């Protein structure tokens, strides 16, 4: 997270850290949507241009963590993966269209003060909140500039009108993405950055006081560049795939 601040304890209890088992290394962010299922970006697992192809036995997730290197026993839980699922029309060649993946845990995790799932949006919630100028919250342990933090970072960012998003990049934007961040004339700054991929973009519904995951940190050009914006997987548009995956398996 660039230009963010330290998270409060239990502020983002759906945060998941994705680690490679051996050698141990922080790979990505992720989010908890049930006691067995974790949502993340497809490019965290499969990205052929970098010879990246992680399968279930290469990975672990850490849930309930607040420090980044410390092993917080009794406060965090480490879970193995039973299976991963990459969107079958995920497009790594051109633009990361449908940058989404599900991971099923080998055992269900017990919820606690530090572990609790985030909601997925329904149609009324998405239409109400996914508007230009409305702010969401991004969290991660990624780099602060294009150093690394000691505690999970958090930053609030406004959704940007889609015509401005398109004009900002040469990549062809699909309907499965939106972009967020401050415009050059707005004074405030902030962005996701390398290592924040796969983490959630969340918004709090004024209608029922619940936090909803609207996006997945997908890609951007640099971090926090004037006139450039971070792009996010449009979770609502892909919600039927998520339900299809969870319902069959």
């Amino acid at each position: 997270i660039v230009e963010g601040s330290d998270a409060e304890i239990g502020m983002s209890p759906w945060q998941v850290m994705l680690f490679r088992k051996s050698p141990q290394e922080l790979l990505c962010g992720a989010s908890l949507i049930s006691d067995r299922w974790v949502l993340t970006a497809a490019h965290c697992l499969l990205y052929p241009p970098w010879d990246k192809n992680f399968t279930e036995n290469d990975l672990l997730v850490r849930i309930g963590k607040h420090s980044r290197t410390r092993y917080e026993r009794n406060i965090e839980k480490i879970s193995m993966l039973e299976k991963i699922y990459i969107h079958p029309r995920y497009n790594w060649r051109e633009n990361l269209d449908r940058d989404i993946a599900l991971m099923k845990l080998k055992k269900p995790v017990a919820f606690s003060d530090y572990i609790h799932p985030v909601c997925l949006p329904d149609r009324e919630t998405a239409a109400s909140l996914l508007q230009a100028g409305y702010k969401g919250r991004v969290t991660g342990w990624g780099n602060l500039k294009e150093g690394q933090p000691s505690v999970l970072q958090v930053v609030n960012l406004p959704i940007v009108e889609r015509p401005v998003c398109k004009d900002s990049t040469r990549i062809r934007i699909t309907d499965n993405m939106f972009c967020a961040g401050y415009k050059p004339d707005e004074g405030k700054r902030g962005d996701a950055c390398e290592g924040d991929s796969g983490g959630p973009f969340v918004m709090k519904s004024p209608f029922n006081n619940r936090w909803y995951q609207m996006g997945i940190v997908s890609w951007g050009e640099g971090c926090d560049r004037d006139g450039k914006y971070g792009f996010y997987t449009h979770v609502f548009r892909l919600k039927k795939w998520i339900q299809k995956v969870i319902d069959q398996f």
Binding site: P49, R89, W92, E94, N95, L96, R98, R123, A126, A127, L130, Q131, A132, G133, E146, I159, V160, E161, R162, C165, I171, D175, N176, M177, F178, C179, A180, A192, C193, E194, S197, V217, S218, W219, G220, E221, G222, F231, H234, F236, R237, L238, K239, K240, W241
Partner: peptide, 17 residues
Amino acid sequence: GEPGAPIDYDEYIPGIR
């Protein structure tokens, strides 16, 4: 005021991240 992306269901070096 404007949607940041369509409210409907999916039918069917890219960045430095």
